Design an enzyme around this catalytic site. Sequence first.
Site, PDB file in Angstrom:
ATOM      1  N   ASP A  62     -47.260  12.892 153.933  1.00 36.35           N
ATOM      2  CA  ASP A  62     -48.420  13.771 153.805  1.00 36.35           C
ATOM      3  C   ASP A  62     -49.628  13.001 153.273  1.00 36.35           C
ATOM      4  OD1 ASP A  62     -49.473  16.669 153.781  1.00 36.35           O
ATOM      5  OD2 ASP A  62     -50.014  15.942 151.767  1.00 36.35           O
ATOM      6  N   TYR A 109     -57.930  11.735 149.689  1.00 37.36           N
ATOM      7  CA  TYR A 109     -57.115  10.929 148.768  1.00 37.36           C
ATOM      8  C   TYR A 109     -57.606   9.491 148.713  1.00 37.36           C
ATOM      9  CZ  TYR A 109     -53.880  14.878 149.448  1.00 37.36           C
ATOM     10  OH  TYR A 109     -53.338  16.133 149.565  1.00 37.36           O
ATOM     11  N   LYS A 124     -55.470  15.711 156.822  1.00 34.17           N
ATOM     12  CA  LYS A 124     -56.241  16.927 156.575  1.00 34.17           C
ATOM     13  C   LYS A 124     -57.735  16.687 156.685  1.00 34.17           C
ATOM     14  CE  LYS A 124     -52.738  17.908 153.042  1.00 34.17           C
ATOM     15  NZ  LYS A 124     -52.524  16.553 152.424  1.00 34.17           N
ATOM     16  N   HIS A 163     -57.978  21.416 155.256  1.00 37.41           N
ATOM     17  CA  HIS A 163     -57.532  21.166 153.878  1.00 37.41           C
ATOM     18  C   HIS A 163     -57.754  22.374 152.953  1.00 37.41           C
ATOM     19  CE1 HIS A 163     -56.736  17.578 150.967  1.00 37.41           C
ATOM     20  NE2 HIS A 163     -56.289  18.707 150.433  1.00 37.41           N
TER      21      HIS A 163
HETATM   22  N1  LIG Z   1     -53.104  20.681 150.454  1.00 37.86           N
HETATM   23  C1  LIG Z   1     -53.464  20.617 149.176  1.00 37.86           C
HETATM   24  O1  LIG Z   1     -54.449  21.202 148.754  1.00 37.86           O
HETATM   25  C2  LIG Z   1     -52.595  19.847 148.232  1.00 37.86           C
HETATM   26  C3  LIG Z   1     -52.715  20.043 146.860  1.00 37.86           C
HETATM   27  C4  LIG Z   1     -51.869  19.330 146.019  1.00 37.86           C
HETATM   28  C5  LIG Z   1     -50.920  18.470 146.566  1.00 37.86           C
HETATM   29  N2  LIG Z   1     -50.821  18.287 147.898  1.00 37.86           N
HETATM   30  C6  LIG Z   1     -49.830  17.360 148.469  1.00 37.86           C
HETATM   31  O2  LIG Z   1     -48.565  17.567 147.827  1.00 37.86           O
HETATM   32  C7  LIG Z   1     -48.117  16.340 147.230  1.00 37.86           C
HETATM   33  C8  LIG Z   1     -47.249  16.592 146.004  1.00 37.86           C
HETATM   34  O3  LIG Z   1     -47.950  17.332 145.002  1.00 37.86           O
HETATM   35  P1  LIG Z   1     -48.572  16.637 143.679  1.00 37.86           P
HETATM   36  O4  LIG Z   1     -48.851  15.193 143.990  1.00 37.86           O
HETATM   37  O5  LIG Z   1     -49.688  17.522 143.205  1.00 37.86           O
HETATM   38  O6  LIG Z   1     -47.446  16.686 142.520  1.00 37.86           O
HETATM   39  P2  LIG Z   1     -45.827  16.711 142.517  1.00 37.86           P
HETATM   40  O7  LIG Z   1     -45.201  16.090 143.735  1.00 37.86           O
HETATM   41  O8  LIG Z   1     -45.425  18.112 142.136  1.00 37.86           O
HETATM   42  O9  LIG Z   1     -45.569  15.757 141.253  1.00 37.86           O
HETATM   43  C9  LIG Z   1     -45.961  14.376 141.266  1.00 37.86           C
HETATM   44  C10 LIG Z   1     -45.682  13.823 139.875  1.00 37.86           C
HETATM   45  O10 LIG Z   1     -44.282  13.920 139.572  1.00 37.86           O
HETATM   46  C11 LIG Z   1     -43.773  12.632 139.213  1.00 37.86           C
HETATM   47  N3  LIG Z   1     -42.420  12.529 139.793  1.00 37.86           N
HETATM   48  C12 LIG Z   1     -42.127  12.377 141.096  1.00 37.86           C
HETATM   49  N4  LIG Z   1     -40.791  12.352 141.233  1.00 37.86           N
HETATM   50  C13 LIG Z   1     -40.239  12.483 140.007  1.00 37.86           C
HETATM   51  C14 LIG Z   1     -38.930  12.516 139.541  1.00 37.86           C
HETATM   52  N5  LIG Z   1     -37.884  12.410 140.396  1.00 37.86           N
HETATM   53  N6  LIG Z   1     -38.714  12.661 138.218  1.00 37.86           N
HETATM   54  C15 LIG Z   1     -39.735  12.776 137.356  1.00 37.86           C
HETATM   55  N7  LIG Z   1     -41.005  12.744 137.773  1.00 37.86           N
HETATM   56  C16 LIG Z   1     -41.279  12.601 139.097  1.00 37.86           C
HETATM   57  C17 LIG Z   1     -44.730  11.622 139.816  1.00 37.86           C
HETATM   58  O11 LIG Z   1     -44.734  10.427 139.039  1.00 37.86           O
HETATM   59  P3  LIG Z   1     -44.834   8.933 139.653  1.00 37.86           P
HETATM   60  O12 LIG Z   1     -45.632   9.059 140.943  1.00 37.86           O
HETATM   61  O13 LIG Z   1     -45.496   8.153 138.530  1.00 37.86           O
HETATM   62  O14 LIG Z   1     -43.401   8.504 139.922  1.00 37.86           O
HETATM   63  C18 LIG Z   1     -46.048  12.358 139.708  1.00 37.86           C
HETATM   64  O15 LIG Z   1     -46.565  12.199 138.369  1.00 37.86           O
HETATM   65  C19 LIG Z   1     -49.416  15.608 146.949  1.00 37.86           C
HETATM   66  O16 LIG Z   1     -49.233  14.213 146.684  1.00 37.86           O
HETATM   67  C20 LIG Z   1     -50.184  15.896 148.213  1.00 37.86           C
HETATM   68  O17 LIG Z   1     -49.596  15.071 149.229  1.00 37.86           O
HETATM   69  C21 LIG Z   1     -51.629  18.969 148.728  1.00 37.86           C
HETATM   70  N1  LIG Z   2     -58.697  20.939 142.073  1.00 36.61           N
HETATM   71  C1  LIG Z   2     -57.894  21.091 143.132  1.00 36.61           C
HETATM   72  O1  LIG Z   2     -57.245  22.101 143.364  1.00 36.61           O
HETATM   73  C2  LIG Z   2     -57.836  19.947 144.088  1.00 36.61           C
HETATM   74  C3  LIG Z   2     -56.401  19.543 144.428  1.00 36.61           C
HETATM   75  C4  LIG Z   2     -56.413  18.375 145.422  1.00 36.61           C
HETATM   76  N2  LIG Z   2     -55.138  17.683 145.534  1.00 36.61           N
HETATM   77  C5  LIG Z   2     -54.859  17.714 146.861  1.00 36.61           C
HETATM   78  O2  LIG Z   2     -53.661  17.065 147.362  1.00 36.61           O
HETATM   79  N3  LIG Z   2     -55.688  18.345 147.723  1.00 36.61           N
HETATM   80  C6  LIG Z   2     -56.612  18.782 146.851  1.00 36.61           C
HETATM   81  O3  LIG Z   2     -57.767  19.529 147.293  1.00 36.61           O
HETATM   82  C7  LIG Z   2     -57.472  17.359 145.051  1.00 36.61           C
HETATM   83  C8  LIG Z   2     -57.466  16.100 145.662  1.00 36.61           C
HETATM   84  C9  LIG Z   2     -58.435  15.162 145.328  1.00 36.61           C
HETATM   85  F1  LIG Z   2     -58.429  13.952 145.914  1.00 36.61           F
HETATM   86  C10 LIG Z   2     -59.414  15.448 144.385  1.00 36.61           C
HETATM   87  C11 LIG Z   2     -59.423  16.697 143.776  1.00 36.61           C
HETATM   88  C12 LIG Z   2     -58.458  17.638 144.110  1.00 36.61           C
HETATM   89  O4  LIG Z   2     -58.498  18.846 143.492  1.00 36.61           O
HETATM   90 CL   LIG Z   3     -58.875  15.675 153.278  1.00 37.99          CL
END
Ligand SMILES: NC(=O)c1ccc[n+]([C@@H]2O[C@H](COP(=O)([O-])OP(=O)(O)OC[C@H]3O[C@@H](n4cnc5c(N)ncnc54)[C@H](OP(=O)(O)O)[C@@H]3O)[C@@H](O)[C@H]2O)c1
Ligand SMILES: NC(=O)[C@@H]1C[C@]2(NC(=O)NC2=O)c2cc(F)ccc2O1
Ligand SMILES: [Cl-]
Length: 316
Positions: free
Chosen positions: A44, A49, A78, A111
């Site tokens: 993803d 990013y 996205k 997005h």
């Molecule tokens: N569409 C949107 O608006 C949107 C919004 C938010 C997120 N996303 C997508 O969803 C993805 C995941 O969400 P997120 O990045 O917000 O957070 P997340 O996956 O819920 O959590 C990431 C955090 O958890 C830690 N972690 C990962 N695996 C672990 C494990 N097995 N044990 C303990 N800690 C662990 C990571 O640390 P380390 O990396 O230091 O190992 C990092 O600090 C994003 O990267 C992005 O691709 C999309």
């Molecule tokens: N405040 C929010 O909800 C969003 C979350 C979010 N993370 C994500 O994967 N999509 C998002 O739009 C994000 C990503 C960025 F690179 C910078 C800011 C940011 O904020």
């Molecule tokens: Cl984007």
Amino acid sequence: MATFVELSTKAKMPIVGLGTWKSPLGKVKEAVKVAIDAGYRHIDCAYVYQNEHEVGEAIQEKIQEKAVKREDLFIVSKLWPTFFERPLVRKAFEKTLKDLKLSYLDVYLIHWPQGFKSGDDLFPKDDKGNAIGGKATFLDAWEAMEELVDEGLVKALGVSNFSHFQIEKLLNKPGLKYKPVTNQVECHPYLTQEKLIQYCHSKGITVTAYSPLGSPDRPWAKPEDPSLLEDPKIKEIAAKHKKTAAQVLIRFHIQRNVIVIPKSVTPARIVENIQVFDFKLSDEEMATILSFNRNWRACNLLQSSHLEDYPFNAEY
Ligand SMILES: NC(=O)c1ccc[n+]([C@@H]2O[C@H](COP(=O)([O-])OP(=O)(O)OC[C@H]3O[C@@H](n4cnc5c(N)ncnc54)[C@H](OP(=O)(O)O)[C@@H]3O)[C@@H](O)[C@H]2O)c1
Ligand SMILES: NC(=O)[C@@H]1C[C@]2(NC(=O)NC2=O)c2cc(F)ccc2O1
Ligand SMILES: [Cl-]
């Protein structure tokens, strides 16, 4: 190794993917390589990013090294809401595709539904701090994205952070050519999304769960905020299965047929996060976890709460 969720296009989307938000330059390339070695096939990504070129380097190297074939990878990116005007949709997509070094994307998502003012800034704001809205809408953006599918550059389109009203508005659009194949939204035991998942599935739209570990590395995390990884009741269920809390948090989505995209740049955790096909949460355990709903969001894009299509004013 990850099993699949079938899309309305009949394409198969791997049910676990690697998240890349906050994965810095200098670490994300190795993270993607480690992920591919461990059997991840779904990555993803996003323009916002600002790390897609390193994701692209990793993928290109793994393909040439014969570790993986492009046909077996599933790459999602996205369109950021400052790029909703037609020529900007193409420009943004082309930059994303060039950075990723691909000839096509598997899914391209809107997005966020609320449009932002176009220009050099990714988060345009006035002198109060609020987000300035844009001229084009997500419906305008969708029309330009459909051209990408017609041209063979994107296999399928989807949406992210859409409420059911916004999906309805899209599905009802006159002249619609392509339906969204997924809605990527925050989902985890504190935000179980029961109504939205039910709605999406009823329309043949999959759900992709973001921040499934509670995004502990989000910049605005506060001491008092709920913490899934530390939840003693999640840990209790985990310890029973000789698994980690993270693995339970990921497996929870799999058993609801929801795609899930945990982020890590730590090799041991990347590997850990995909060892989730060798155990099963009981019906009782699933119900217990489901009961943890708090309607809590890690991601709110707060500064854009006043815009017309801010998605989170709706019940679902
Ligand atoms: N569409 C949107 O608006 C949107 C919004 C938010 C997120 N996303 C997508 O969803 C993805 C995941 O969400 P997120 O990045 O917000 O957070 P997340 O996956 O819920 O959590 C990431 C955090 O958890 C830690 N972690 C990962 N695996 C672990 C494990 N097995 N044990 C303990 N800690 C662990 C990571 O640390 P380390 O990396 O230091 O190992 C990092 O600090 C994003 O990267 C992005 O691709 C999309
Ligand atoms: N405040 C929010 O909800 C969003 C979350 C979010 N993370 C994500 O994967 N999509 C998002 O739009 C994000 C990503 C960025 F690179 C910078 C800011 C940011 O904020
Ligand atoms: Cl984007």
